[PDB]
Amino acid sequence: VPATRILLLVLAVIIYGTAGFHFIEGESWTVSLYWTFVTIATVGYGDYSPSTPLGMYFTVTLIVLGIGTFAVAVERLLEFLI
Amino acid sequence: VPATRILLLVLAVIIYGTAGFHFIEGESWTVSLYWTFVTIATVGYGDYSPSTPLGMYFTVTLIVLGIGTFAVAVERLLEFLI
Amino acid sequence: VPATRILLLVLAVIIYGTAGFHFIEGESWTVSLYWTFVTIATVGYGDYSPSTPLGMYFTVTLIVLGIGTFAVAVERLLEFLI
Amino acid sequence: VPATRILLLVLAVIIYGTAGFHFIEGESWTVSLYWTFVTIATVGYGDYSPSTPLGMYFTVTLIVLGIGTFAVAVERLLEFLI
Ligand SMILES: [K+]
Ligand SMILES: [K+]
Ligand SMILES: [K+]
Ligand SMILES: [K+]
Ligand SMILES: [K+]
């Protein structure tokens, strides 16, 4: 995949994760963006996590769609900076 | 490995993780499925974690069997969507 | 690397992590073995974590030596089971 | 990339992460170095995490710049020890 296409794909993931956590779990937009990165990078501090069943379902969907996408995006960013 | 075989393998992992956490640590089926994904993806929020020795042993077995399986499944899903 | 050599290397990592957490942070052998796997797999629940400076130093040493070793061992175990 | 260049790159990441967490979130230098490794290795215990908006932004920047760099450094260290 061209590197710019990978960029758009992870941006789409980040939008999905952020808006979903905001609306489902009710955290601010900023906290939700932070949580989305912490989740798809697999860091997982746990300072924020879903506490509702819908949130848990949604979080599984973000884990499945987002972790591989982020990993490829990181791998590509590595090339254009090193 | 054919992609559909990898799908079945991770589904088997998800069943093992979920039923085990449910019966050993006593959390609901839904929470247990959520915990299983959060564990084999290596996110690890810690909102749920085993608190019994059997649970800790079981969790090590899920980590060894499940993290590589999930990683391959993600890598394959990437191909059939990008 | 031959797969059996990788097995011995991760076992050595697991012994190092477990005895170190036990003696430095004072948790039981079982909890310490559990923490060692949760750490080198990068799950990181945080139900257990070092609270002393020596423990924090030691944990960095386990992260550097152990995460790559575990990742290779998982990758190999995948081959001999799939 | 030559292995010594990768070493310098991850050291630069570690300096960036440590000084940033120290000054933005106010934790000691030692705790901040520990947190930086726990973050870029994707362990993410959550015993320490940013609680300010600037800290959350900064942490996203460390996740994007640091996780791939650490992963390559681990992969290389593996070669020069096995
Ligand atoms: K983690
Ligand atoms: K974690
Ligand atoms: K990899
Ligand atoms: K992780
Ligand atoms: K955690």
- Tell me the longest C-alpha to C-alpha distance in chain A: 42
Nearest chain D residue to A37 by CA distance is D60
Token pair for residue A49?
Answer: 């996590």
DSSP conformation class of B50: -
Interval between CA C2 and ligand 2 midpoint (Å) = 31
Q: How far apart are CA B11 and CA A66, in angstroms?
A: 18
Cβ contact C82–B44 (<8 Å): no
Q: Does D68 touch chain A (CB under 8 A)?
A: yes
> In units of Å, what resolution does this entry have?
1.6
Q: How far apart are CA C6 and CA C70, in angstroms?
A: 9
Q: Does B45 touch chain D (CB under 8 A)?
A: yes
CA distances from C26 to A4, C17, C77, D36 (A): 50, 13, 32, 24
Residues of chain D positioned with their CB less than 8 A from the CB of C1: 82
CA angle C2, B70, C76 (to 5 degrees): 5
Q: How far apart are CA A58 and CA B34, in angstroms?
A: 10
Instruction: Report whether D21 contacts D55 (CB < 8 A).
Output: yes
Task: Say how many residues make up chain C.
Answer: 82
Q: What is the 3-state secondary structure (H, E, C) of D12-42?
A: HHHHHHHHHHHHHHCCCHHHHHHHHHHHHCC
Instruction: Report whether D24 contacts D55 (CB < 8 A).
Output: yes
Burial of C67 (0-12, 13-18, 19+ CB in 10 A): buried
Instruction: Report whether A33 contacts D50 (CB < 8 A).
Output: no
If phi > 0 it is left, if psi is from -120 to 50 it is alpha, else beta; for residue D20 that is: alpha
Chain C: closest CA distance from residue A44 (Å): 8
Nearest chain D residue to C61 by CA distance is D37
Token pair for residue B31?
Answer: 């929470």
Question: What determination technique applies here?
Answer: X-ray
- Spatial CB neighbours of A19, under 8 Å, sequence gap ≥ 6: A32
